[PDB]
Amino acid sequence: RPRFSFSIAAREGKARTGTIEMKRGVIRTPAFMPVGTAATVKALKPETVRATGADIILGNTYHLMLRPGAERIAKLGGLHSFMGWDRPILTDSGGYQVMQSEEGVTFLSPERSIEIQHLLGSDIVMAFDECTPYPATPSRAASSMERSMRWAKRSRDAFDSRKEQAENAALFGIQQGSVFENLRQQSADALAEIGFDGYAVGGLAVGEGQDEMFRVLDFSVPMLPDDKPHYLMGVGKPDDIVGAVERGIDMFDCVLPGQAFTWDGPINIRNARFSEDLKPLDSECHCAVCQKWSRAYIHHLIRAGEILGAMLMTEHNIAFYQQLMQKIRDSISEGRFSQFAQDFRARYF
Amino acid sequence: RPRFSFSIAAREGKARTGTIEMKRGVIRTPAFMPVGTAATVKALKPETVRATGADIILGNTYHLMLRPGAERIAKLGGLHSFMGWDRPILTDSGGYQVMQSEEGVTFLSPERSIEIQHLLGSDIVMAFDECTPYPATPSRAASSMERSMRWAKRSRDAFDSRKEQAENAALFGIQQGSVFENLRQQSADALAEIGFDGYAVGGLAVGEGQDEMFRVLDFSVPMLPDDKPHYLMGVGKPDDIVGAVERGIDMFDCVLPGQAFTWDGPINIRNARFSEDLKPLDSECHCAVCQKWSRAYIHHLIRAGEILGAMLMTEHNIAFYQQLMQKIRDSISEGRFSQFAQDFRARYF
Ligand SMILES: CNc1nc2cc3c(=O)[nH]c(N)nc3c(CCO)c2[nH]1
Ligand SMILES: CNc1nc2cc3c(=O)[nH]c(N)nc3c(CCO)c2[nH]1
Numbered sequence: 211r212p213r214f215s216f217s218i219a220a221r222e223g224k225a226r227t228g229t230i231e232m233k234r235g236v237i238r239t240p241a242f243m244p245v246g247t248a249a250t251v252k253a254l255k256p257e258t259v260r261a262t263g264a265d266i267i268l269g270n271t272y273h274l275m276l277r278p279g280a281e282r283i284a285k286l287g288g289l290h291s292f293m294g295w296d297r298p299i300l301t302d303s304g305g306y307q308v309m310q311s312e313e314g315v316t317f318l319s320p321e322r323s324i325e326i327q328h329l330l331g332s333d334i335v336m337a338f339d340e341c342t343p344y345p346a347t348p349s350r351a352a353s354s355m356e357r358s359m360r361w362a363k364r365s366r367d368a369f370d371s372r373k374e375q376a377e378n379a380a381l382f383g384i385q386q387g388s389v390f391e392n393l394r395q396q397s398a399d400a401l402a403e404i405g406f407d408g409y410a411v412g413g414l415a416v417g418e419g420q421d422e423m424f425r426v427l428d429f430s431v432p433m434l435p436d437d438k439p440h441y442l443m444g445v446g447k448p449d450d451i452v453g454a455v456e457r458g459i460d461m462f463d464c465v466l467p468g469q470a471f472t473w474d475g476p477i478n479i480r481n482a483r484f485s486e487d488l489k490p491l492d493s494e495c496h497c498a499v500c501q502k503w504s505r506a507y508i509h510h511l512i513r514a515g516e517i518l519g520a521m522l523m524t525e526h527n528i529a530f531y532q533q534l535m536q537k538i539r540d541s542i543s544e545g546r547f548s549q550f551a552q553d554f555r556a557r558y559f
Numbered sequence: 560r561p562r563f564s565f566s567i568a569a570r571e572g573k574a575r576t577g578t579i580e581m582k583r584g585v586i587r588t589p590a591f592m593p594v595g596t597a598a599t600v601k602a603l604k605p606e607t608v609r610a611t612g613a614d615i616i617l618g619n620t621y622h623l624m625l626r627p628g629a630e631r632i633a634k635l636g637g638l639h640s641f642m643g644w645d646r647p648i649l650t651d652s653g654g655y656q657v658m659q660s661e662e663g664v665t666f667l668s669p670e671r672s673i674e675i676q677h678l679l680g681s682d683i684v685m686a687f688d689e690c691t692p693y694p695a696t697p698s699r700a701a702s703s704m705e706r707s708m709r710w711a712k713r714s715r716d717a718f719d720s721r722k723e724q725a726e727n728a729a730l731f732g733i734q735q736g737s738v739f740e741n742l743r744q745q746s747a748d749a750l751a752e753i754g755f756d757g758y759a760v761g762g763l764a765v766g767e768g769q770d771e772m773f774r775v776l777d778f779s780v781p782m783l784p785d786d787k788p789h790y791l792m793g794v795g796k797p798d799d800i801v802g803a804v805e806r807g808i809d810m811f812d813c814v815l816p817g818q819a820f821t822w823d824g825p826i827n828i829r830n831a832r833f834s835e836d837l838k839p840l841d842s843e844c845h846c847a848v849c850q851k852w853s854r855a856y857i858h859h860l861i862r863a864g865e866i867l868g869a870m871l872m873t874e875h876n877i878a879f880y881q882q883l884m885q886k887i888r889d890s891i892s893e894g895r896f897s898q899f900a901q902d903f904r905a906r907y908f
């Protein structure tokens with residue numbers, strides 16, 4: 211397969227569906243990336259993560275840098291070998307989880323972030339950025355944005371200077387700018403000038419609320435190169451994903467999928483009303499959990515603090531997200547995504 | 560299949576190998592029964608428990624009686640349906656975990672214990688007994704033993720008076736008597752007079768140490784009917800199992816399989832010497848964990864408090880026990896068990 215190839219198979223308004231081809235596999239887009247904190251997707255074997263339909267997972271660099279150490283994982287064969295996932299892995303750059311000078315952060319520099327991700331053997335490397343607090347003054351937003359762009363250039367150069375990394379991995383840049391249109395535009399132009407394999411929209415999902423996140427996406431995503439993947443970092447709830455895809459986003463990650471997702475909205479399985487409910491978590495869900503166990507059982511397990519409860523809840527939730535992504539992909543492919551988004555919402559809410 | 564049929568296919572000294580046929584499946588003996596506390600074998604799906612080679616699991620009545628309640632599980636379809644295990648289940652009677660009058664224990668009577676196990680849908684019901692503290696004075700041992708035998712009769716009658724239970728399930732009686740030969744003999748004769756499907760040796764593995772446990776087994780197991788299964792409750796360590804089989808025991812249960820069993824003895828995977836060990840937990844073990852992950856990875860997981868660490872450690876350990884039982888079964892079948900026991904021990908220690 212190539213190092214990196216993004217192809218758009220179909221479109222509807224700003225939404226797109228297609229594929230990212232990488233040496234370790236193909237990623238169907240719009241994509242949801244389960245989060246593996248500490249070299250594991252919580253409570254799931256990789257084979258289970260893959261059976262839910264995930265094409266790619268996200269590796270949490272900050273934690274790995276602290277344990278087991280990036281150098282140790284490299285000696286051990288790389289993250290893929292270590293945890294037993296052989297498909298693409300995206301690594302964040304560590305800044306975000308760490309939260310200060312122009313050279314980096316003490317507690318990590320653009321150079322050391324890129325090196326750590328290489329040591330982990332990441333397939334999609336994130337540039338090292340400075341996330342901007344919300345809310346932010348225009349001056350402070352600007353300063354932070356500016357630093358990040360400087361750091362994006364340093365990231366690019368560090369990535370390119372490492373031949374095995376440049377030839378086998380991809381590099382994504384991260385747009386910053388808080389909620390300010392002019393700042394987002396300067397950030398997009400600066401990253402397009404440097405040139406990246408894909409473009410993340412950073413600095414959102416940091417307490418601004420869905421209306422303001424969607425308002426910023428409305429002008430920010432069209433500033434990014436159309437022909438490259440658009441990743442919204444840290445999002446999110448099913449409703450957020452649907453609206454983000456409608457605004458041109460292709461890739462997502464979220465941590466925490468007793469809350470269970472259903473097509474009728476989320477439920478909390480700890481609720482006493484589920485103690486004798488023999489129905490599965492969701493009535494339509496095709497996942498193994500919903501094939502085999504009841505609400506009543508999982509209810510008991512979670513209230514009992516049993517590990518099988520977390521295993522089963524997480525498999526379901528990640529399977530639900532994957533099925534959501536599949537329905538978004540299929541509806542765009544068939545040009546009925548706007549109808550799917552309306553039907554989804556009516557029911558979900 | 561019949562309600563209950565025990566057949567002995569082969570023998571060597573006091574050791575035996577054969578099968579117990581029950582309506583929900585066949586149990587290969589000598590058998591190890593994984594323990595499901597709170598209607599789950601800790602950190603394992605039932606399909607995983609079965610893939611390790613378990614033929615039967617033990618259900619923990621005391622906990623189930625407290626949550627979710629035996630009546631609730633019955634309404635929900637029985638323990639098998641509830642937790643998704645369709646093979647035989649053995650239930651303890653609850654006394655042991657609860658730890659007082661002739662009628663039962665307040666905090667459970669022979670009658671209520673039998674009824675609860677029926678409500679759970681148990682395949683092998685344990686009589687309700689009074690476990691005797693260790694150490695015990697001869698007088699106190701005797702009194703306790705006597706009560707238990709009285710309670711064994713009440714258990715028998717309660718079981719038999721419930722037609723669906725008597726026709727579909729089996730009842731095991733429990734020998735008591737502390738470490739005193741005369742008391743064990745009175746206990747065995749009293750239970751044989753009542754008549755049971757199988758005979759457990761109770762009151763051991765309660766701090767007496769392996770030498771004294773083996774000394775008591777030496778005279779106690781031959782007192783039980785030869786043609787029925789002999790169950791040693793609560794045992795135990797691999798070395799204990801091997802010596803117990805050599806003394807005529809057919810069935811076992813143990814809770815807690817960072818400790819990992821290997822044919823070279825137990826290891827503690829938390830030990831820093833495993834942080835970069837790429838070997839599997841055990842060099843010969845055929846389980847999925849040893850096929851796929853390293854010591855170094857599981858080491859990281861356990862130290863990180865990750866749930867995948869417990870899942871992987873427990874699958875390995877229960878698979879190891881099952882492989883141990885298989886090698887005991889095969890060696891008796893081939894009349895080389897005493898040689899296997901010696902080779903095992905040399906290596907294990
Ligand atoms: C939960 N919301 C959220 N907003 C984010 C914003 C950023 C960001 O701006 N930059 C980087 N590197 N990471 C981010 C992350 C971690 C994504 O898992 C975010 N996560
Ligand atoms: C861990 N050692 C042990 N000794 C036991 C002794 C007894 C006993 O004497 N009677 C009953 N009912 N249960 C027992 C149990 C629970 C077995 O999981 C024991 N467990």
Ligand SMILES: [Zn+2]
Pocket residue numbers: 491492495496497498499500501526527529530
């Ligand atoms: Zn499901």
Ligand SMILES: [Zn+2]
Pocket residue numbers: 840841844845846847848849850875876878879
């Ligand atoms: Zn193993």
